[PDB]
Design a protein around this ligand. Structure first.
Ligand SMILES: Nc1ncnc2c1ccn2[C@@H]1O[C@H](COP(=O)(O)OP(=O)(O)OP(=O)(O)O)[C@@H](O)[C@H]1O
Length: 381
């Protein structure tokens, strides 16, 4: 099996880790990033871009970019969830072999269709390449994570994505479990209840797990399938679009690429505001050959999103109800997902649990890959 890698295949961002020289190493991609966008795009010359290069490609044709394949993976075309999601996806989705295939122009007017697992395979291929560059050798085997609520077809389609990518997915493990393993919560005595609060780019998952004898049970799951960091970005986008209109008289949404530029800068500023109190947003040739320069405080970022932040507590309360537990029954709280880097989110979860500190010390957008890599280390032997 060689050196088995651990992969978090995320809706919006993916992460790969390996066990080397006695510990888990989270691997940076060829752009220097320890997470990679689950994104595909095409150049006009017909080059396929994957990851950062695909997300960062300026385009007036969002219909030929592909993302959010995890929303479609392992589902039938006629699945009501698919039919709802296709309303919001800018790329074409068509019924083929009972499934939602993605249809795009890949260069020079050539049209191709891809199954969701074929798009996910492209992302896994990039994750494989990232690991191989670090290791200085090929890898053939992986542990891959999925949401705990994933069903038989979604799990199998994830394994199939691996196969297409040249990875033998040896184990599929649940995301909240992988996070708990990252924090060593499996190597604990007695029965314990663990609440995993996972707030990512596109989705919010809460899971109640019990751990006993090093065996995990997923007791209940809840969340919101379309709440995450992208929604916080959009609140900030709406803020600056409106300010630019009141300031200049003009609506920037007429230019795809301007919106794209602002989105990239807003996301970067949001990330800055998890560790500083103000951030500068600056864009040359933003709109009509005019420059954009604005600032955003942490207080304003929180004010713009407070309702969304506060909405994350309801699914936590539902998971407790469904597990027949009260707050005091929770022995461990694990924060997962990039958006839990937000100070206000950390504050809100602590307050919900009457001052209880969550687990700490692993970057939350890496914790799932980390636990996958822990398991991969044992399988590497
Ligand atoms: N320092 C920070 N402060 C605030 N948010 C942060 C960061 C760093 C990253 N992010 C935001 O985290 C979101 C991505 O989360 P993720 O867990 O990496 O994504 P993923 O595993 O795909 O989650 P999901 O889309 O499957 O729910 C994205 O929205 C990132 O913008």
């Amino acid at each position: 099996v060689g050196t088995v890698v651990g992969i978090d295949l995320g809706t919006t961002y993916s992460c790969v880790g390996v066990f080397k020289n006695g510990r888990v190493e989270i691997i940076a991609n060829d752009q220097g990033n320890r997470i990679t966008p689950s994104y595909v795009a095409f150049t006009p010359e017909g080059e396929r871009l994957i990851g950062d290069a695909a997300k960062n490609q300026l385009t007036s044709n969002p219909e030929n970019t592909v993302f959010d394949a995890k929303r479609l993976i392992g589902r039938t075309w006629n699945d009501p969830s698919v039919q709802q999601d296709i309303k919001f996806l800018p790329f074409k989705v068509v019924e083929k072999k009972t499934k939602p295939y993605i249809q795009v122009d890949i260069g020079g007017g050539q049209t191709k269709t891809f199954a969701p697992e074929e798009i996910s395979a492209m992302v896994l291929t990039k994750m494989k390449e990232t690991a191989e560059a670090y290791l200085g050798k090929k890898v053939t085997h992986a542990v891959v994570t999925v949401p705990a609520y994933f069903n038989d077809a979604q799990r199998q389609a994830t394994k199939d994505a691996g196969t297409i990518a040249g990875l033998n997915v040896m184990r599929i493990i649940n995301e909240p479990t992988a996070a708990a393993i990252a924090y060593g919560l499996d190597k604990r005595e007695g029965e314990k209840n663990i609440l995993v609060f996972d707030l990512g780019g596109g989705t919010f998952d809460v899971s109640l797990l019990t751990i006993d004898n090093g065996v995990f049970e997923v007791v209940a799951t809840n969340g919101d399938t379309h709440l995450g960091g992208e929604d916080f970005d959009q609140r900030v986008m709406e803020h600056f679009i409106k300010l630019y209109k009141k300031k200049t008289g003009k609506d920037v949404r007429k230019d795809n690429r301007a919106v794209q530029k602002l989105r990239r800068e807003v996301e970067k500023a949001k990330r800055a505001l998890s560790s500083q109190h103000q951030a500068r947003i600056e864009i040359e040739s933003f709109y009509e050959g005019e420059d954009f320069s604005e600032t955003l405080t942490r207080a304003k970022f929180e004010e713009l999103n407070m309702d969304l932040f506060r909405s994350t507590m309801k699914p936590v309360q539902k998971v407790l109800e469904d597990s027949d537990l009260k707050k005091s029954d929770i022995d461990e709280i694990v924060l997962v997902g990039g958006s839990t880097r937000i100070p206000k989110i950390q504050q809100l979860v602590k307050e919900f649990f009457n001052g209880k500190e969550p687990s700490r010390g692993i970057n939350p957008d890496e914790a799932v890959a980390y636990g996958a890599a822990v398991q991969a280390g044992v399988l590497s032997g």
